[PDB]
Enzyme design. Structure first.
Site, short mmCIF file in Angstrom:
data_model
loop_
_atom_site.label_atom_id
_atom_site.label_comp_id
_atom_site.label_asym_id
_atom_site.label_seq_id
_atom_site.Cartn_x
_atom_site.Cartn_y
_atom_site.Cartn_z
N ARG B 11 0.76 -1.20 0.09
CA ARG B 11 -0.03 0.07 -0.05
C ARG B 11 0.73 1.14 -0.08
O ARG B 11 0.58 2.34 -0.60
CB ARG B 11 -0.84 0.04 1.00
CG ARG B 11 -1.59 -1.26 1.43
CD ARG B 11 -2.60 -1.58 0.36
NE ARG B 11 -2.26 -3.07 -0.06
CZ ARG B 11 -2.86 -3.86 -0.40
NH1 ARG B 11 -4.22 -3.92 -0.54
NH2 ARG B 11 -2.46 -5.14 -0.87
N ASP B 59 12.58 4.71 27.01
CA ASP B 59 11.66 5.33 28.02
C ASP B 59 12.09 4.49 29.31
O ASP B 59 11.97 3.15 29.52
CB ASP B 59 10.01 4.83 27.58
CG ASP B 59 9.01 5.54 28.43
OD1 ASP B 59 8.96 5.43 29.90
OD2 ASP B 59 8.18 6.25 27.78
N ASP B 127 6.32 14.57 27.38
CA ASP B 127 5.82 15.53 27.77
C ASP B 127 6.49 16.18 28.99
O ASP B 127 6.02 15.72 30.19
CB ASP B 127 4.18 15.35 28.15
CG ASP B 127 3.45 15.01 26.81
OD1 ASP B 127 3.18 15.91 25.97
OD2 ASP B 127 2.90 13.91 26.52
N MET B 129 8.85 19.72 29.51
CA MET B 129 9.71 21.04 28.79
C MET B 129 11.30 20.84 29.04
O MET B 129 11.89 21.18 27.97
CB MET B 129 9.39 22.21 29.51
CG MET B 129 9.76 23.35 28.88
SD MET B 129 9.50 23.67 27.12
CE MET B 129 8.11 24.44 27.06
N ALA B 130 11.67 20.20 30.22
CA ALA B 130 13.24 20.11 30.29
C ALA B 130 13.64 18.98 29.09
O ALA B 130 14.33 19.57 28.46
CB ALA B 130 13.50 19.82 31.88
N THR B 131 13.31 17.92 29.39
CA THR B 131 13.63 16.94 28.35
C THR B 131 13.81 17.70 27.11
O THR B 131 14.80 17.49 26.01
CB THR B 131 12.98 15.77 28.40
OG1 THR B 131 12.72 15.26 29.54
CG2 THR B 131 13.69 14.62 27.58
N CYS B 184 -3.06 24.39 34.71
CA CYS B 184 -4.28 24.08 35.02
C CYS B 184 -5.22 23.05 34.49
O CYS B 184 -5.39 21.94 35.01
CB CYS B 184 -5.11 25.37 34.87
SG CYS B 184 -6.54 25.60 36.07
N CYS B 240 19.82 33.29 19.81
CA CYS B 240 19.33 31.97 20.51
C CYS B 240 20.61 31.31 20.91
O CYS B 240 21.04 31.01 19.93
CB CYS B 240 18.44 31.12 19.58
SG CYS B 240 18.05 29.62 20.11
N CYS B 243 20.64 28.60 18.19
CA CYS B 243 20.80 29.10 16.78
C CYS B 243 21.16 30.65 16.85
O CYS B 243 20.42 31.37 17.37
CB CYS B 243 19.40 29.05 16.21
SG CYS B 243 18.83 27.72 15.78
N1 LIG Z 1 -20.25 -3.76 4.59
C1 LIG Z 1 -19.28 -4.06 5.37
N2 LIG Z 1 -19.33 -4.86 6.36
C2 LIG Z 1 -18.24 -4.91 7.51
N3 LIG Z 1 -16.94 -4.86 6.91
C3 LIG Z 1 -16.87 -4.32 5.64
C4 LIG Z 1 -17.79 -3.75 4.99
N4 LIG Z 1 -17.19 -3.20 3.92
C5 LIG Z 1 -15.78 -3.15 3.92
N5 LIG Z 1 -15.63 -3.81 5.21
C6 LIG Z 1 -14.29 -3.85 5.93
O1 LIG Z 1 -13.75 -2.77 6.39
C7 LIG Z 1 -12.47 -2.51 6.41
C8 LIG Z 1 -11.86 -1.34 5.85
O2 LIG Z 1 -10.78 -1.79 4.78
P1 LIG Z 1 -9.59 -0.97 4.50
O3 LIG Z 1 -9.58 -0.09 3.30
O4 LIG Z 1 -8.99 -0.31 5.88
O5 LIG Z 1 -8.51 -2.38 4.45
P2 LIG Z 1 -8.67 -3.75 3.71
O6 LIG Z 1 -10.17 -3.37 2.92
O7 LIG Z 1 -8.79 -4.47 4.91
O8 LIG Z 1 -7.09 -3.19 3.11
P3 LIG Z 1 -6.61 -3.20 1.88
O9 LIG Z 1 -6.85 -1.83 1.19
O10 LIG Z 1 -5.24 -3.56 1.92
O11 LIG Z 1 -7.52 -3.97 0.80
C9 LIG Z 1 -11.92 -4.09 5.98
O12 LIG Z 1 -11.44 -4.89 6.92
C10 LIG Z 1 -13.09 -4.47 5.13
O13 LIG Z 1 -13.26 -5.84 5.07
N1 LIG Z 2 13.80 12.08 29.30
C1 LIG Z 2 12.98 11.28 29.13
N2 LIG Z 2 13.65 10.03 28.48
C2 LIG Z 2 12.88 8.84 28.05
N3 LIG Z 2 11.34 9.07 28.30
C3 LIG Z 2 10.90 10.06 28.83
C4 LIG Z 2 11.58 11.11 29.25
N4 LIG Z 2 10.67 12.18 29.65
C5 LIG Z 2 9.40 11.48 29.70
N5 LIG Z 2 9.67 10.40 29.44
C6 LIG Z 2 8.62 9.22 29.05
O1 LIG Z 2 7.84 9.74 27.89
C7 LIG Z 2 6.26 9.35 28.07
C8 LIG Z 2 5.23 10.49 27.70
O2 LIG Z 2 4.08 10.26 28.60
P1 LIG Z 2 2.77 10.79 28.60
O3 LIG Z 2 2.77 12.34 29.05
O4 LIG Z 2 2.16 10.37 27.40
O5 LIG Z 2 2.21 9.81 29.37
P2 LIG Z 2 2.93 9.49 31.08
O6 LIG Z 2 3.91 10.50 31.21
O7 LIG Z 2 3.27 8.15 30.69
O8 LIG Z 2 1.34 9.81 31.50
P3 LIG Z 2 0.65 10.46 32.75
O9 LIG Z 2 0.14 11.77 32.37
O10 LIG Z 2 -0.29 9.25 33.14
O11 LIG Z 2 1.39 10.73 33.64
C9 LIG Z 2 6.49 8.47 29.31
O12 LIG Z 2 6.01 7.08 29.29
C10 LIG Z 2 7.46 9.17 30.19
O13 LIG Z 2 8.01 8.21 30.94
ZN LIG Z 3 17.17 28.88 18.02
#
Ligand SMILES: Nc1ncnc2c1ncn2[C@@H]1O[C@H](COP(=O)(O)OP(=O)(O)OP(=O)(O)O)[C@@H](O)[C@H]1O
Ligand SMILES: Nc1ncnc2c1ncn2[C@@H]1O[C@H](COP(=O)(O)OP(=O)(O)OP(=O)(O)O)[C@@H](O)[C@H]1O
Ligand SMILES: [Zn+2]
Ligand SMILES: [Zn+2]
Lengths: 232, 244
Positions: B11, B59, B127, B129-131, B184, B240, B243
């Site tokens: 694809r 992570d 997420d 700011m430091a990192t 907040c 900066c 930069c």
């Molecule tokens: N009327 C329908 N009822 C239930 N499922 C459906 C129906 N029409 C299409 N689908 C399904 O919806 C999905 C979306 O297809 P998509 O274009 O995402 O991937 P594919 O059809 O699985 O992919 P490819 O493009 O590789 O052929 C498929 O898994 C397809 O079988």
């Molecule tokens: N310096 C870093 N190095 C590697 N991973 C990091 C670093 N700082 C943050 N992360 C990781 O990056 C990811 C992003 O987290 P996200 O904000 O999506 O969810 P969380 O921090 O896992 O969620 P929650 O908000 O529930 O606390 C985390 O899994 C976090 O542990």
């Molecule tokens: Zn800069």
């Protein structure tokens, strides 16, 4: 609502626009995901993680190797098992606390209508113009909101059509694919389903288009067709 | 290139902008993903499925239950198991024919430096700011592109900064190393919102590696509440400490 569930949904529960109220609505909702491909895959994943009470995962097809480039819910080891089955099992592992119904078949005629009826929101994730047109008719008939999306090449398409049908339905309107471009569209169908089920106000009468190459969005005003085979 | 590969990436290969040669580039590239949470989890997923030759996943955290609402790569069975390990493990099952390296730590000092070096593109998925500010420092020093994003509540932020640094760096937009008043709302975050963001970091990494022509030096904002996008033009801050 126990310790497990509070922690599980904590990052939503503390949001003013969702809160316990929204989480409660989600957990009382049922969404129909017709099609488990590039779109439906991330969508089902996010709606399950969000805690939608019941997910009806419909799809009459099995995994394929080419599928593994954008259908993130599957692995190579599922290569020949049916999708509705694999999804259902993999999503249960994610959230064992919700209802996950596998509907292994191609929805049409009555089967479709029974499903659309018993649903709060329907996500058309099939990439087939015919199915959509059928789905649309079912949704308009049974006044059930429909979130539909397309994704071809680097472009995406999204619509939210709801019950009052003020801007018409799909009937009034009418190659390869980059993984992420379908994903964004899928994940977005989920965002809308959540916002709809939790009562968040969101624009709906429009066709949101995405161009992943230039990286910009566009919008087209939708308008119901004067005298239409459905919205009448 | 293979025959099994051709099928798997079909694809993608059928795209005029990627084609077979581009797929080779993807397969010859290395992507560093610092952070495997809400942004990194879907990013790593789509990059693996898109066939990025090598993926370094860093992570230091473990899988917690509250994560399972948006970090789609994990499952409840993975609770308490380290994120990098679990991530690597699951990506391997998606695409066994890829080079996946699990970094169970917090990239800083030189560790972060030489890791950015060997990287073709770096995805800041932390997420924090430091990192983020030191990833920027390292990415600008070792001239490695940086795709950073963030999400809070219903809002998401993405930004692509390329080697020449035509429009400055992160430090060119934020001198401090402390969070903004986005403290907040931070009561939590909406799954699909951060999801769209991480997924977009992947799209941008694909295009950069497959040499596709796509803007940069633009701050892109997403409002999940209204479902609207916005773009803020960036521009190098004369003087900066990075930069300039
Ligand atoms: N009327 C329908 N009822 C239930 N499922 C459906 C129906 N029409 C299409 N689908 C399904 O919806 C999905 C979306 O297809 P998509 O274009 O995402 O991937 P594919 O059809 O699985 O992919 P490819 O493009 O590789 O052929 C498929 O898994 C397809 O079988
Ligand atoms: N310096 C870093 N190095 C590697 N991973 C990091 C670093 N700082 C943050 N992360 C990781 O990056 C990811 C992003 O987290 P996200 O904000 O999506 O969810 P969380 O921090 O896992 O969620 P929650 O908000 O529930 O606390 C985390 O899994 C976090 O542990
Ligand atoms: Zn800069
Ligand atoms: Zn109509």
């Amino acid at each position: 609502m126990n310790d497990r569930d509070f922690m599980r949904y904590s990052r939503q529960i503390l949001l003013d626009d969702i809160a316990l109220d929204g989480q409660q609505k989600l957990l009382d909702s049922q969404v129909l995901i017709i099609g488990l491909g590039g779109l439906g895959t991330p969508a089902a994943l996010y709606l399950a993680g969000a805690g939608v009470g019941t997910l009806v995962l419909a799809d009459d097809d099995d995994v394929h190797l080419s599928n593994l480039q954008r259908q993130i819910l599957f692995t190579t080891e599922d290569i020949d098992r049916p999708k509705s089955q694999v999804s259902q099992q993999r999503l249960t592992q994610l959230n064992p606390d919700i209802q996950l119904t596998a509907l292994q078949q191609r929805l049409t005629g009555e089967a479709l209508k029974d499903a659309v009826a018993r649903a709060d929101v329907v996500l058309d994730c099939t990439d087939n113009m015919a199915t959509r047109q059928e789905i649309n008719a079912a949704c308009v008939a049974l006044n059930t909101p429909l979130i539909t999306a397309s994704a071809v090449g680097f472009g995406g398409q999204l619509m939210v059509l709801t019950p009052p049908w003020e801007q018409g339905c799909y009937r009034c309107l009418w190659a390869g694919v980059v993984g992420p471009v379908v994903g964004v569209m899928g994940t977005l169908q989920a965002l809308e389903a959540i916002k709809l089920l939790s009562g968040i106000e969101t624009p709906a009468g429009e066709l949101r288009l995405f161009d992943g190459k230039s990286s910009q969005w566009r919008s087209l005003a939708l308008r119901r067709a004067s005298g239409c085979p459905v919205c009448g």
